[PDB]
């Protein structure tokens, strides 16, 4: 196996096609990273050559991506969050987000009271939809059956458990509270 530097001759446009993290010019394929030389043969020949470091310390979000978050504060019409994980991998820093009162459920419906959906301190799984404005920057959504709060936390510091699609209950004091439970 061989590694890369962010420029070198790799292949012709006839001997393969550019993949992820690469660029081409003057009929040649040029590297743009310092990762590893991967040639996805796939099926149909002409492998899509690409270079991947495979050790992602940081990664910029996209138009569509799954992210693990952490609520900071909640408002009657939005809920500021902090992006913590990009899908699976840990993130070295923390970005910001905002869930408007249209992205909670998968119907973009009326009602949907924000107060009992995303209580602060929880950890949720959500998907971005846009690159946002300067007020709200990433505009995340949870309009799916698989998205919502996944690992909640009790009033007094006890791991919480899902109890229904909308209700969760404390194991110690048997107290009933409202969340937006995502499928496991």
């Amino acid at each position: 196996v061989r590694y890369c530097i962010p420029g070198e001759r790799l292949c012709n446009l006839e001997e393969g096609s550019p993949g992820s993290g690469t660029y081409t010019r003057h009929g040649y394929i040029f590297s743009s990273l310092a990762g590893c030389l991967m040639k996805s043969s796939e099926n149909g020949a002409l492998p899509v050559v690409s270079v991947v470091r495979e050790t992602e310390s940081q990664l910029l979000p996209d138009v569509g991506a799954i992210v693990t978050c952490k609520v900071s504060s909640i408002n009657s019409r939005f809920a500021k969050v902090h992006i913590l994980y990009v899908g699976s991998m840990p993130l070295k820093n923390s970005f910001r987000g905002t869930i408007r009162k249209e992205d909670v459920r998968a119907t973009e419906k009326d009602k949907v009271e924000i107060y009992k959906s995303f209580r602060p301190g929880d950890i949720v799984l959500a998907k971005v939809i846009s690159l946002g404005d300067a007020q709200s920057n990433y505009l995340l959504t949870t309009a799916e059956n698989e998205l919502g709060v996944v690992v909640a936390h009790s009033e007094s510091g006890i791991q919480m458990v899902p109890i229904s699609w909308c209700e969760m209950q404390c194991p110690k004091t048997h107290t009933k509270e409202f969340r937006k439970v995502a499928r496991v």
Binding site: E108, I129, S130, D133
Partner: protein, 289 residues
């Protein structure tokens, strides 16, 4: 190539080159305008104690009960059904922000826009994601004012076929008081180019669209015979706008023909403008008179 470096010349005051006396009524701030029994204040004046006091330099213009003062230098003020030209400076969640040389910014609502497709298919929140993609930062449009807000703001719409994103050409910005009110601000001058006389002071010059909204890019080279016409109109517009001239179709046509004898590159001198503006002045005098 000689790199002429001339020296400043003293200005001749009083406009003695022609000689005229004004019959109007001129005022300065603090002057007491007519103070008869009952009158209504206009724009440019205010009221003190039983007095109509002018608040800006200009000339009084009255239509049968109304004392007002018309200043000679202002910024654009919006009116319903007015052709304007502007540039996008902010792209928001549900609107754009357009700069049109006004006291505030102008809002182009997403509800009023000929979206790509140009027909009845649908309008929903799926378009909102890509709305901020085509009308990006720093583009040029040409729309019409819709209504007046409660704080002097203007909302402008693009609900026609002649309005929308513009293409190639040059832009010339002047004061919004040298454009003559008319009923056709779109022109197709028989020279090789066109023009849009924005009521806000934005003049847009583009070539004729060959035969026959921003859907077409047409980012292909423009013929040599078209640039020389655009440059000629650009310089002639600068020449008429500089001294006094109010801009409209006949003045530009008259000056363009008068500019043929000598080259387009050499018309930047203080005197060549005078010898062209005066010739257009006398052509207007021998035609209107």
């Amino acid at each position: 190539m000689a790199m002429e470096m001339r020296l400043p010349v003293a200005r001749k005051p009083l406009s003695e080159r022609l000689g005229r006396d004004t019959k109007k009524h001129l005022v300065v701030p603090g002057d007491t305008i007519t103070t008869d029994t009952g009158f209504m204040r206009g724009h440019g004046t205010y009221m003190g104690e039983e007095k109509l006091i002018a608040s800006v330099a200009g000339s009084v213009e009255r239509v049968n009960k109304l004392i007002c003062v018309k200043a000679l230098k202002t910024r654009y003020i919006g009116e319903v059904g007015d052709i304007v030209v502007g540039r996008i400076t902010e792209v928001q969640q549900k609107r754009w922000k357009v700069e049109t040389n006004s006291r505030l910014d102008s809002v182009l609502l997403l509800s009023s826009m000929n979206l790509p497709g140009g027909e009845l298919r649908r309008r929903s929140a799926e378009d909102e994601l890509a709305m901020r993609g085509f009308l990006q930062e720093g583009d040029l449009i040409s729309a019409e004012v819709q209504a007046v807000f409660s704080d002097g703001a203007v909302s402008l719409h693009t609900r026609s076929l002649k309005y929308g994103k513009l293409g190639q050409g040059v832009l010339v910005q002047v004061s919004p008081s040298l454009v003559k009110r008319q009923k056709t601000h779109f022109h197709d001058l028989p020279c090789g180019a066109s023009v849009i006389l924005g009521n806000n002071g934005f003049i847009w010059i583009y070539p004729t669209p060959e035969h026959k909204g921003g859907f077409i890019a047409n980012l292909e080279p423009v013929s040599l015979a078209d640039r020389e016409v655009i440059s000629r109109l650009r310089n002639c517009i600068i020449s008429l706008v500089t001294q006094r001239m109010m801009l409209y179709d006949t003045s530009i046509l008259y000056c363009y023909e008068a500019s043929l004898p000598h080259q387009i590159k050499d018309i930047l001198k203080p005197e060549i403008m005078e010898e062209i503006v005066m010739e257009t002045r006398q052509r207007l005098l021998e035609q209107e008179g």
